[PDB]
Enzyme design. Sequence first.
Site, PDB file in Angstrom:
ATOM      1  N   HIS D  80       0.737  -1.101  -0.115  1.00  0.00           N
ATOM      2  CA  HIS D  80       0.028   0.016   0.064  1.00  0.00           C
ATOM      3  C   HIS D  80       0.851   1.132   0.057  1.00  0.00           C
ATOM      4  CE1 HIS D  80      -1.287   3.068   3.068  1.00  0.00           C
ATOM      5  NE2 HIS D  80      -2.264   3.080   2.280  1.00  0.00           N
ATOM      6  N   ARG D  81       1.830   1.507   0.684  1.00  0.00           N
ATOM      7  CA  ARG D  81       2.681   2.509   0.860  1.00  0.00           C
ATOM      8  C   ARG D  81       4.097   2.148   1.424  1.00  0.00           C
ATOM      9  NH1 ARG D  81       1.969   7.938  -0.429  1.00  0.00           N
ATOM     10  NH2 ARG D  81       0.006   8.118   0.502  1.00  0.00           N
ATOM     11  N   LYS D 121       5.960  -7.464  10.093  1.00  0.00           N
ATOM     12  CA  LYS D 121       6.352  -8.082  11.371  1.00  0.00           C
ATOM     13  C   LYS D 121       7.184  -9.219  11.342  1.00  0.00           C
ATOM     14  CE  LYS D 121       5.680  -6.991  14.946  1.00  0.00           C
ATOM     15  NZ  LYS D 121       6.562  -6.055  15.813  1.00  0.00           N
ATOM     16  N   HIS D 204      18.889  10.167  19.131  1.00  0.00           N
ATOM     17  CA  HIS D 204      18.774  10.326  20.391  1.00  0.00           C
ATOM     18  C   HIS D 204      17.286  10.306  20.936  1.00  0.00           C
ATOM     19  CE1 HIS D 204      23.078  12.119  19.540  1.00  0.00           C
ATOM     20  NE2 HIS D 204      23.169  11.288  20.648  1.00  0.00           N
ATOM     21  N   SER D 376      11.008   6.020  14.953  1.00  0.00           N
ATOM     22  CA  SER D 376      11.501   5.240  13.852  1.00  0.00           C
ATOM     23  C   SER D 376      11.555   5.985  12.455  1.00  0.00           C
ATOM     24  CB  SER D 376      11.024   4.045  13.873  1.00  0.00           C
ATOM     25  OG  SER D 376       9.447   3.813  13.529  1.00  0.00           O
ATOM     26  N   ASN D 382      16.577  10.646   9.035  1.00  0.00           N
ATOM     27  CA  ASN D 382      18.003  10.856   9.364  1.00  0.00           C
ATOM     28  C   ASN D 382      19.167  10.147   8.505  1.00  0.00           C
ATOM     29  OD1 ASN D 382      20.462  11.693  10.512  1.00  0.00           O
ATOM     30  ND2 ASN D 382      19.988  10.927  12.448  1.00  0.00           N
ATOM     31  N   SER D 388      22.684  14.995  10.294  1.00  0.00           N
ATOM     32  CA  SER D 388      22.070  15.049  11.413  1.00  0.00           C
ATOM     33  C   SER D 388      21.057  16.268  11.158  1.00  0.00           C
ATOM     34  CB  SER D 388      23.185  15.651  12.554  1.00  0.00           C
ATOM     35  OG  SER D 388      22.486  15.764  13.796  1.00  0.00           O
ATOM     36  N   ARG D 454      -1.437  16.564  15.799  1.00  0.00           N
ATOM     37  CA  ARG D 454      -2.455  16.268  14.454  1.00  0.00           C
ATOM     38  C   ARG D 454      -3.158  15.199  14.191  1.00  0.00           C
ATOM     39  NH1 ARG D 454       0.584  17.188   8.931  1.00  0.00           N
ATOM     40  NH2 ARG D 454       1.086  15.071   9.220  1.00  0.00           N
TER      41      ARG D 454
END
EC number: 1.4.1.3
Lengths: 496, 496, 125, 496
Positions: D80-81, D121, D204, D376, D382, D388, D454
């Site tokens: 789907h995405r 999963k 972090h 995640s 990142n 960074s 949101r």
Amino acid sequence: DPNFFKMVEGFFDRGASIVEDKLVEDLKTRETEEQKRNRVRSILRIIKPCNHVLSLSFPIRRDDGSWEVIEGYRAQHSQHRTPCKGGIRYSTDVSVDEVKALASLMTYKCAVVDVPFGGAKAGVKINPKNYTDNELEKITRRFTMELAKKGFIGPGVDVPAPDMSTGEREMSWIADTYASTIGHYDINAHACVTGKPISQGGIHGRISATGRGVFHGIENFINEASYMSILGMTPGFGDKTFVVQGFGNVGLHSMRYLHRFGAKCITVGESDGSIWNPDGIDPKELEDFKLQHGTILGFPKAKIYEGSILEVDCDILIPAASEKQLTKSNAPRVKAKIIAEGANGPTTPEADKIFLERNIMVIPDLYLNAGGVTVSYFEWLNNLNHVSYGRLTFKYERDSNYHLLMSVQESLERKFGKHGGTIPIVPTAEFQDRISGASEKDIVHSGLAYTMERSARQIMRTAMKYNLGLDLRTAAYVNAIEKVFRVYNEAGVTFT
Amino acid sequence: DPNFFKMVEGFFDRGASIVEDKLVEDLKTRETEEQKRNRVRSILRIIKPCNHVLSLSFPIRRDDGSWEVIEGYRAQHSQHRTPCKGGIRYSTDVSVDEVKALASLMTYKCAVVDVPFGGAKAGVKINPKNYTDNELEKITRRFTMELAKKGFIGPGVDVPAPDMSTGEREMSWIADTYASTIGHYDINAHACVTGKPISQGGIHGRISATGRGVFHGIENFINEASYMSILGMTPGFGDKTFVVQGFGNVGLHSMRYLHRFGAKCITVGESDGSIWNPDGIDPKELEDFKLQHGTILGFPKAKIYEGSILEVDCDILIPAASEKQLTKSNAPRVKAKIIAEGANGPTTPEADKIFLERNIMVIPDLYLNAGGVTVSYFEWLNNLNHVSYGRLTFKYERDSNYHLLMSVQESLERKFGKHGGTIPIVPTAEFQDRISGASEKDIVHSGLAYTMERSARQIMRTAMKYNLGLDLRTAAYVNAIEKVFRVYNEAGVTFT
Amino acid sequence: AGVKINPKNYTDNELEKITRRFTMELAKKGFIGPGVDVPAPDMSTGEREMSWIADTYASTIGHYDINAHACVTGKPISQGGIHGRISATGRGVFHGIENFINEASYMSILGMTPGFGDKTFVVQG
Amino acid sequence: DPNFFKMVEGFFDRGASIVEDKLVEDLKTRETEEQKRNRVRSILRIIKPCNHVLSLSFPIRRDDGSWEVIEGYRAQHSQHRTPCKGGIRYSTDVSVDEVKALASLMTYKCAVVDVPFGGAKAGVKINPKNYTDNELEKITRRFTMELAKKGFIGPGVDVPAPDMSTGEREMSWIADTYASTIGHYDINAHACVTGKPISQGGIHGRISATGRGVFHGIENFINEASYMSILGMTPGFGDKTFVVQGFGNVGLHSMRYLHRFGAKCITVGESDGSIWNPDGIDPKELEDFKLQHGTILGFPKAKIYEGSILEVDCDILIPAASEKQLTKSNAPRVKAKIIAEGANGPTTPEADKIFLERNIMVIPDLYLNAGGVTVSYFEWLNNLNHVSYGRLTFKYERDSNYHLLMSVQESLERKFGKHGGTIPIVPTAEFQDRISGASEKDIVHSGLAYTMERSARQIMRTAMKYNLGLDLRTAAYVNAIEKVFRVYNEAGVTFT
Ligand SMILES: NC(=O)C1=CN([C@@H]2O[C@H](COP(=O)(O)OP(=O)(O)OC[C@H]3O[C@@H](n4cnc5c(N)ncnc54)[C@H](O)[C@@H]3O)[C@@H](O)[C@H]2O)C=CC1
Ligand SMILES: NC(=O)C1=CN([C@@H]2O[C@H](COP(=O)(O)OP(=O)(O)OC[C@H]3O[C@@H](n4cnc5c(N)ncnc54)[C@H](O)[C@@H]3O)[C@@H](O)[C@H]2O)C=CC1
Ligand SMILES: NC(=O)C1=CN([C@@H]2O[C@H](COP(=O)(O)OP(=O)(O)OC[C@H]3O[C@@H](n4cnc5c(N)ncnc54)[C@H](O)[C@@H]3O)[C@@H](O)[C@H]2O)C=CC1
Ligand SMILES: NC(=O)C1=CN([C@@H]2O[C@H](COP(=O)(O)OP(=O)(O)OC[C@H]3O[C@@H](n4cnc5c(N)ncnc54)[C@H](O)[C@@H]3O)[C@@H](O)[C@H]2O)C=CC1
Ligand SMILES: NC(=O)C1=CN([C@@H]2O[C@H](COP(=O)(O)OP(=O)(O)OC[C@H]3O[C@@H](n4cnc5c(N)ncnc54)[C@H](O)[C@@H]3O)[C@@H](O)[C@H]2O)C=CC1
Ligand SMILES: NC(=O)C1=CN([C@@H]2O[C@H](COP(=O)(O)OP(=O)(O)OC[C@H]3O[C@@H](n4cnc5c(N)ncnc54)[C@H](O)[C@@H]3O)[C@@H](O)[C@H]2O)C=CC1
Ligand SMILES: Nc1nc2c(ncn2[C@@H]2O[C@H](COP(=O)(O)OP(=O)(O)OP(=O)(O)O)[C@@H](O)[C@H]2O)c(=O)[nH]1
Ligand SMILES: Nc1nc2c(ncn2[C@@H]2O[C@H](COP(=O)(O)OP(=O)(O)OP(=O)(O)O)[C@@H](O)[C@H]2O)c(=O)[nH]1
Ligand SMILES: Nc1nc2c(ncn2[C@@H]2O[C@H](COP(=O)(O)OP(=O)(O)OP(=O)(O)O)[C@@H](O)[C@H]2O)c(=O)[nH]1
Ligand SMILES: Nc1nc2c(ncn2[C@@H]2O[C@H](COP(=O)(O)OP(=O)(O)OP(=O)(O)O)[C@@H](O)[C@H]2O)c(=O)[nH]1
């Protein structure tokens, strides 16, 4: 004079029309007649046009420093049977209309002679009388970095070949590029072009191929009692006398090879002159003088008999010259009994009637010149499986063959233990060559003729099937379409 | 009437000629004058033609079962700045000559407004009034499986876009294919086309973009005392009154947005009628009736004043209609003071003199309609870095901003510890929206105008540099070529 | 590989829409390919089917491969099949027996006389 | 007790049913009602099942020399995405039925909180209490060489994540492999997994994320006068007192963070004990003792008050413990006013009625625990753009910010040239940190909460839209499906 695109286009249109009726009858998938007949009339609209036509433009920098643009084309007539294959022409006459045209022929050549290739063709607008040993490299080595970036060169997608103004030297420059920039991570990189120099993965007999192709063409029909009789002709090369329309890379060999089997080369010609010696002419001497004198107009054992060879006595004629040697403006002046075309489009469709009306047989230019194509199809295999033909298995048959005779001899020793004593069953001088002169060369010389054989019969079977009689061109295009149709018909062409 | 290919071709020819002298003076690499001048006259021959022009043919199977062939084109004007980008047109008028043409413009749009794209364009010969919700899918989803197999679609090689008869719905079908067959092993697959539906990775404001592009075009010149004076014009939107040549996807918005800043929309029109109300017209009501009535010919608060809007009072005119709205056959009938072209080629080169001779300013159609292009260049980034614009950093500025005021307040508490006591420095209602109504939308609305700003100045700088005065079209094409040249000049274009 | 379909339900066309999809899936996950995996015909899977597979893998993914049409076997003879793809299994059964019925080490032990010209057989269908 | 696969399955079945009516009304494409309603009932059958479920088996060689087989699973709920994302569980309980289950949730988490990920999963049948520091490497580093060879790991196709028995240490071993064997020729190789050690491209706040996710969940509803009133609750954290169901990686932080804003942690517990101190409990001391004593059953300033925390006074409860903490067998024993679920499936669907019947609000476990997911999704950015967060632009805002105040000061110098003289507008101590303590950390801490904001509003908007009132779970699954549907509805899912 028609457009050579339009003139070929019209051919299979006839061929498509003829097979049309027979073909719906032959299909079996249960459908409505009008449906499964408008079906084939629709598939046959797919086969006609070309599926890809690429146009280019090159920043070539000349030797003097200046720049210039190079319009260059490429057309793949059908992804029908990958990889597509076609030559690369250098000439200012090249136009996208003609490139589409030839791409069609190459697709039906391959269909005739059963080589699994599509059909392509590519030109550039260059008059190589302008550039140097170096600019041509800067061009060709660029005309491949372009096509390759867009999936039009590659051992599995498309394979160039030589054409006019494109010798071995060129095709080397192509492979030396595609196998160094993009195809580098491929085992099959050097399979990208054929007609390479023999050093870099060529084939012995890449030059004489087309000629020795023309030869085994005629030999498959002149040995047909079903036509030789109907043609009012006596079966056998040792019986007939022929002529030649020039000394192209074709003529030099087509002459010599047919010369080797007793057919008498009556006369020959040039692009700028005539020759005649109605009592047989020597190939080799000509192969000397045409290279010793740059012309045979002055070959001593013949005469410069100005006039169209096409109007000279011959039991077999070979229009081995460039496009449109014939119109009906000389159809009453054939003087021949069997014409076997050398190059593409030597005859207008018009006169073809008259030859039939004058009751001769003009073997089509489709497969005659396609002798070379198959040879390319072999070099594309030699390179593909990375081994000279039969080097693995040469000494093996050599062993077995005269390790077999030694049994026959030994087995005769039973009945003839003392009658005549030892009986040295040995080969002959000739059969010794086929042993000791074993080479990939002879494989080609073999595989070539057999392709022409099985092909040329597929035509005589077709002509009988549709009562075309002496209509070989049609039957050929009919036989090609019959094949190309099968592929689409089953492919469920819709990929979506 | 010229060929729109030839008519655009001629434009930069002028532009190439003008920069020609200035440019050799500007290059520094020590060479011979004639050499490093025939140099640029040679590079400028490279830029003109298209580098790739692909032609196709599709076995489309209709809904009824029948087959048909779909001639489809594609042209990449220059690999100059990858990836190339251009729309996809559906129309039977599409011909390879026009596809080459537009590909040129898209290459110079992008040069004007500084978006790193080459230029492409692709058509197919289809009248979408023939096919269904489904056949179009069977076509488009096939016109991409072809191009993709030949390196003409891909997030780094080429990027389609919408055009006439090509809504959102279409561009979805493309991405849904390239991101499922070939680009599947790529992270950047869905970057293949822009103008996708907002769900599947679109941008808010993909529709109203071009219009709001036209707007920030004018606002960058109508605020120029160097022209408004010379044009005999008073600087300010709140001062001027304009008109509109239709209600395209452009007009509906170009009107409304300029409507929002006090410029009075005098009159408007239609492809099949006229409207006039010389005292200001309401966008929204029209946006109702043109969708309530399918036409505003009957908008009550105006009049159907038949006649060319191009011949009606206006301080700003927008020929926001299709090709060649103007010839010199009405150049004495401009009635305008500043014309800002909406679509490609609304005016013949001929009349452009007369407008200059009648001393007005006709802003070129190059960059005005290019407002949309940049927006596409943003959707090609949104998709590229896989994150809504600024969602990462929205609440951060919201924090800092009114975590900054709270310092000013607190810092005033020093001087005013008891004079007035607590001083609630707070935002305004508007500046609250820019906080609370934070969205990728407003980034676009922002980034859009700034591109137009920095662009439109690059032109006014150019016009001054070459004393072109009110010759913006030229200066634009001059400013484009100036840029595209830099890339080639340094690339050492020779890859061999 | 199976699918839960009773081909007595679908048409000349839906089967295409299925098979031509069951390969765009597997191919995206490395379970079809001339060097990784090669389908073959089974029950309810004639020549006609295996064509639809190759016609897909050799048009979407394997397009940049010389070995694309090596992806499935049992293709129609036109599209790169083999003469004798149908009669194969049968003529396989044959040369099976002929390699043991010519064994004196078993024919004796089986109490059997070596030779096809000697024996009489039956067939279960 | 249902199958956790079946129990989740049933959820959206309800959700699919509810949106079903509203959705056909909302679609616009002109079709037959029954058709464009059986349409959506058909698309909603596509979304339910998983599109890929892979099973594996590993020749792992143990430390002693012996071999053994490792059954390992993987399921991608929907392409789907792209790219799909989900954790990797190590546990012998792992079965293909449960892997399908979770894959569903991860697909609807991402839908809720608007992160462009599918859902995956993967488990293996291993009890990590058996293997060593080394065998686990020999396993994980093999469970990726398998998946990668079959297109189930890759920065654009699928992205693993940590789960139970899968710390940082593991996810390093994965990336250290995929970025060394297959993805080596990719710039995006190290984007293959998230939760990597901060050294190797982590973020972090990867640990405290989920907890600080739970926090901003509640804060988006406890600040809602539309519910706090209806719930009979007083808006504000400084007003309410809460409890915690354990000290997971969630509890340790969810406690502490909500602890930081005046909400009183009444009591806490353990997987093997109880704690109670109805007058506020110190996080840090527990964070000591639970690591000093390996248990807080003996925390001096509280009591080991055996009994379900779920049956203890609280204005907010957090079932931050493992699966199915609730049935209706204690639904009359809620003692709470708002329950916000920490882990997946803490409550049976049954009791959910009773809570509604007892008139409380149980915020769904869909998005609360999904705080980690977004984090995640940031580490996957990142790593993706190789920089960074904000290091490029940190000193820039630092400059501008107090290069802006210096204007306000200077601008006040006009009105106050001599009234009070120099007026040092300066930051505060706090606003100085947001300058000097600038770090990618604070970006996350920022971007995290705003996503939750949101998101949580998209639910309260949904509940109002369908009069679900206090039915958040449904509304959530409704809000997820509403989104996932849009993607399919427009994709013209048929790729053929
Ligand atoms: N029944 C008939 O009329 C014919 C039967 N055959 C059979 O096929 C075999 C020869 O086929 P091969 O190509 O040598 O082996 P193959 O296994 O590659 O055969 C492929 C088939 O496709 C056709 N074909 C070949 N090249 C083609 C091209 N470039 N474009 C479109 N179609 C093409 C040929 O007719 C051939 O039958 C023979 O053993 C013969 O039994 C061949 C020709 C006619
Ligand atoms: N060389 C190759 O591999 C292939 C060549 N061909 C075709 O064969 C034809 C020529 O063979 P090439 O190999 O090019 O050999 P070539 O280039 O060496 O042929 C030129 C020969 O034709 C003669 N010639 C030209 N026009 C003539 C005319 N009107 N009358 C009489 N003689 C004339 C010349 O004097 C000369 O002997 C062309 O049509 C070419 O496309 C086709 C396939 C392959
Ligand atoms: N000195 C001058 O006349 C100009 C200077 N600039 C400088 O360049 C910067 C703007 O460039 P950006 O593109 O925003 O960043 P960039 O770092 O990508 O700049 C690339 C350069 O290539 C040129 N360019 C951009 N798009 C092009 C296209 N599609 N085809 C050919 N050339 C193209 C632009 O003039 C630009 O200067 C500004 O910071 C400004 O300082 C920009 C325009 C004119
Ligand atoms: N839609 C887009 O994203 C882009 C559109 N364009 C161009 O903009 C132009 C039209 O804008 P579209 O977006 O296509 O909107 P549209 O298709 O909705 O525009 C049609 C409008 O033009 C009017 N019209 C047509 N011919 C007219 C004439 N001779 N006089 C007065 N009004 C006339 C129609 O009545 C109608 O209001 C075209 O040239 C198109 O290529 C250019 C770039 C992007
Ligand atoms: N009208 C409405 O009810 C809503 C509108 N929006 C608009 O969309 C923007 C937010 O979208 P973003 O994702 O931040 O930017 P985006 O440009 O990537 O938006 C993609 C769209 O797809 C949907 N989506 C996001 N993640 C998804 C997933 N994993 N699976 C399926 N669908 C998914 C979202 O609803 C989003 O509207 C906001 O600016 C807002 O204006 C967002 C949510 C609801
Ligand atoms: N760690 C992560 O990144 C994520 C964890 N989760 C889920 O969160 C849950 C646990 O959080 P973890 O991060 O695994 O932390 P953890 O593994 O450190 O959590 C264990 C804690 O739960 C307590 N506990 C267990 N069963 C209990 C019961 N019946 N009553 C009271 N306390 C009990 C233990 O004593 C301990 O304090 C699981 O459901 C897990 O799948 C979900 C998403 C991400
Ligand atoms: N026979 C022959 N070969 C030539 C001539 N000019 C160039 N050649 C080349 O010389 C090669 C000779 O071929 P060989 O392998 O030695 O002998 P062959 O293949 O059995 O038959 P030929 O080619 O006719 O000699 C051919 O492949 C041509 O490429 C020529 O005039 N006559
Ligand atoms: N304003 C406006 N928007 C329209 C109209 N027709 C369709 N739309 C769409 O509605 C959207 C409204 O945009 P919004 O994001 O709500 O507001 P905005 O972007 O600040 O400015 P507008 O687009 O003018 O409303 C636009 O992006 C268009 O795509 C119309 O007639 N007027
Ligand atoms: N012999 C035979 N062939 C059949 C029959 N039905 C279909 N066929 C097909 O017809 C082909 C005939 O094979 P041929 O190549 O003509 O002859 P063959 O291979 O030497 O031996 P056969 O297959 O037994 O005829 C086979 O390959 C089958 O695929 C049948 O009933 N008997
Ligand atoms: N605060 C806190 N951090 C812990 C604890 N145990 C481990 N950590 C780690 O220490 C890090 C401390 O985060 P910092 O960046 O120093 O401070 P912060 O992110 O502003 O907020 P905190 O994480 O609560 O300290 C967290 O990211 C955790 O990964 C703990 O008990 N309390």
